[PDB]
Amino acid sequence: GSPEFPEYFRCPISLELMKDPVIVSTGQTYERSSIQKWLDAGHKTCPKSQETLLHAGLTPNYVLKSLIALWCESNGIE
């Protein structure tokens, strides 16, 4: 029983959790402030195993916001 999950709720970036979650190639959905922080730096690899995103384009994924927004409501996480 551990609250460990890559997506859906908290970001694996720094356990900040996401509000507006952004999808990128490779199918990652993390918070823009965490992902685009390093993607903008010129890198395009996932934080999991460094799966090269190849095409670095930020596609806003609205599926997760209502979910993550639910979890940071349970615990004030950021």
| Closest by CA position to 72, among listed 1, 16, 2 | 16
Beta bridge partners of 28: 24
Cβ atoms of 18 and 60 within 8 Å: the answer is no
The number of folded domains in the chain is 1
**Strand, coil or helix: what is 22?**
strand
Chain centre to alpha carbon of residue 19 = 9
**Nearby residues of 51 by Cβ (< 8 Å), 6 or more positions away:** 26, 45
CATH of the domain at 4: 3.30.40.10
User: What technique was this entry resolved by?
Assistant: NMR
Residue 26 to residue 61: CA distance in whole angstroms: 13
Count other Cβ atoms within 10 Å, centred on residue 71: 16
Residue 66 to residue 7: CA distance in whole angstroms: 13
Domain that holds residue 63: 1-78
